Design a protein around this ligand. Sequence first.
Ligand SMILES: COc1ccc(O[C@@H]2O[C@H](CO)[C@H](O[C@H]3O[C@H](CO)[C@H](O)[C@H](O)[C@H]3O)[C@H](O)[C@H]2O)cc1
Length: 198
Amino acid sequence: MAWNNIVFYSLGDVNSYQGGNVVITQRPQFITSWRPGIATVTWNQCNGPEFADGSWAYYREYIAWVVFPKKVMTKNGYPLFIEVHNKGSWSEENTGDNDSYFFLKGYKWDQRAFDTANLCQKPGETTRLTEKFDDIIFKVALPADLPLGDYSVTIPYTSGIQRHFASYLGARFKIPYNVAKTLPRENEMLFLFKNIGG
Ligand SMILES: COc1ccc(O[C@@H]2O[C@H](CO)[C@H](O[C@H]3O[C@H](CO)[C@H](O)[C@H](O)[C@H]3O)[C@H](O)[C@H]2O)cc1
């Protein structure tokens, strides 16, 4: 029978970005970059063989994901409104969700492969993801009642690659958006700025 194995490899990079001194009318920006590194399985769904031994054909479909919040609360209890400034080539999907942005990039599909590989790594197992993807530039709208002073906002978010292995040519799968937005948010963008007022 036909089989499909899908595994989500989660990246866990911590980065920071300085917005500097801002007046309340500014939309200061921050850049999120994709850093190749070690990723951990945080989700899978498999019904096929556990691994390929280098002698038989299977098919690959890989899709990169970034799931980012639309609103973040400061530690003093105020909302910061996150807006997309420049998403590059990313596919911005499921735009009606009120809480999260979904950025996808399907970069490999229908690729026949033979070589040895674990086709269904379990949660907590790791691999090195060598892929590089485009930056995403966001901008922040501050509420007019934001208290004056220093802000250091930790924005947790999910980024990683969905790897789909199948027994046939033409195989397609996408992790449901509501599962993707409930995946561990292992990346962090620490946005630093100071509210000078208005
Ligand atoms: C053989 O002919 C083909 C015609 C068109 C194709 O489209 C590509 O399909 C890919 C399938 O993995 C991939 O699409 C995925 O990723 C997109 C975002 O980048 C989007 O989320 C799609 O819904 C998703 O399926 C490529 O991006 C498509 O260009 C493939 C073969």
